[PDB]
Amino acid sequence: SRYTTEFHELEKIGSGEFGSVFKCVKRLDGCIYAIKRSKKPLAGSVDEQNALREVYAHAVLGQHSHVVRYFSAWAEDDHMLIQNEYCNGGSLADAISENYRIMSYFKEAELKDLLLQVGRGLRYIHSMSLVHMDIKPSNIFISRKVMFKIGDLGHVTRISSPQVEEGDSRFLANEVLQENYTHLPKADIFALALTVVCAAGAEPLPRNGDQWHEIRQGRLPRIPQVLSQEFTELLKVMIHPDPERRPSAMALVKHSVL
Ligand SMILES: CC(=O)NCC(=O)N1[C@@H]2CC[C@H]1c1ccc(Nc3ncc(C(F)(F)F)c(NC4CCC4)n3)cc12
Ligand SMILES: [Cl-]
Ligand SMILES: [Cl-]
Predict the structure, then answer these.
(1) How is it modified after translation?
(2) Would the CATH topology of 1-63+69-87 be identical to that of 64-68+88-258?
(3) Which atom belonging to ligand 1 lies closest to the Cα atom of 151?
(4) Which of 62, 16, 189 shows the shortest CA–CA distance to 118?
(5) Residue 88, Cβ neighbours under 10 Å: how many?
(6) CATH class for the domain made up of 1-63+69-87
(7) How far is the CA of 195 from the centre of ligand 3 (A)?
(8) Does the annotation count 134 as an active-site position?
(9) SS (H, E, C) the chain
(10) Can you give the residue ranges of every domain in the chain?
(11) Whole-number Cα distances in Å, 39 to 36, 47, 75, 234
(12) Contacts of 206 (CB under 8 A, 6+ apart)
């Protein structure tokens, strides 16, 4: 087994529909990697395209400081193993859930830092003619003196001739749900705004119903802590019902707020 031959397993760090992920030491270099163990996707299936989407994306992108690195992938028995960069801070979803536990929270200054860092990852992805299409806190990772990294590229597709697999409906822009795949970079912007809203302590986001449509009409979820009215205004226009009104990642990362 390549897995046990060249890695030593330290700790299971996650499980779910995605399979399970283990923190491991690679014996040769002594470095830490997050290895994902999934059922071998059925050939010709959705899961296979997800996995080849992920391969293509990292091959296009290569290494970037705000993207979780992708090292190798192989099969053993009826499972697929993926070797990724290990981010010692977990996902933003873990950090949020931790904030509820200890009654802490991300201040405006930290929320701005989160927006800028992920914005730069998006800036790079979009500059390479790709879109991520599943931005959300559980796909943002933390290396700790803090680096935010975009992970799980299974939904990445090309701006020209896209193959869209819709992301989590809680973070999905209305126009994508309407099968309008013509301004997809602004779908990432929309989902990043709501990702930051979650980080700010907002209540869990709706999957459907009155509240869902109210957000897609441009109404920002209520945030308990106090933010400058202009930072609030920035998040608002990132969820503007008109995608062309939302700032591009390029515009977002050259935006004035530091
Ligand atoms: C004793 C100990 O070390 N515990 C720490 C722990 O359990 N962790 C730390 C902090 C919360 C949780 C946790 C989850 C994930 C990571 N890191 C990580 N890095 C890369 C990936 C990557 F696979 F995307 F690359 C990844 N995937 C998550 C696991 C569920 C999906 N997680 C780190 C941690
Ligand atoms: Cl098996
Ligand atoms: Cl098994």
Answers:
(1) Phosphorylated during M and G1 phases. Also autophosphorylated. Ubiquitinated and degraded at the onset of G2/M phase.
(2) no
(3) 24
(4) 189
(5) 11
(6) alpha beta
(7) 34
(8) yes
(9) CHHHHHEEEEEEEEEECCEEEEEEEECCCCCEEEEEEEECCCCCCHHHHHHHHHHHHHHHHCCCCCECCEEEEEEECCEEEEEEECCCCCEHHHHHHHHHHHCCCCCHHHHHHHHHHHHHHHHHHHHCCEECCCCCHHHEEEECCCEEEECCCCCCEECCCCCCCCCCHHHCCHHHHCCCCCCCHHHHHHHHHHHHHHHCCCCCCCCCCHHHHHHHCCCCCCCCCCCCHHHHHHHHHHCCCCHHHCCCHHHHHCCCCC
(10) 1-63+69-87, 64-68+88-258
(11) 10, 10, 9, 41
(12) 170, 212, 215
- Residue recorded with tokens 């907002």: 202
Q: How was this structure determined?
A: X-ray
Question: Which of 12, 21, 97, when mutated, tests ligand 1's pocket best, judged by the most ligand atoms within 8 Å of its CB?
Answer: 21
Q: In angstroms, rounded to a whole number, what is the distance separating the alpha carbons of residues 43 and 38?
A: 14
The tokens describing 106, both together, are 């991300």
> Which residue of 69, 91, 146 sits with most ligand 1 atoms within 8 Å of its CB, as the best mutation to test the pocket?
91
* Token pair in block for residue 160: 């020209």
Closest C-alpha to ligand 1, atom 1? 11
Catalytically annotated residue among 29, 77, 134, 168: 134
Please give the structure tokens belonging to residue 12.
């299971």
List all residues 6 or more positions away from 70 whose beta carbon is below 8 Å from its beta carbon: 54, 55, 58, 82, 83, 84, 85, 153
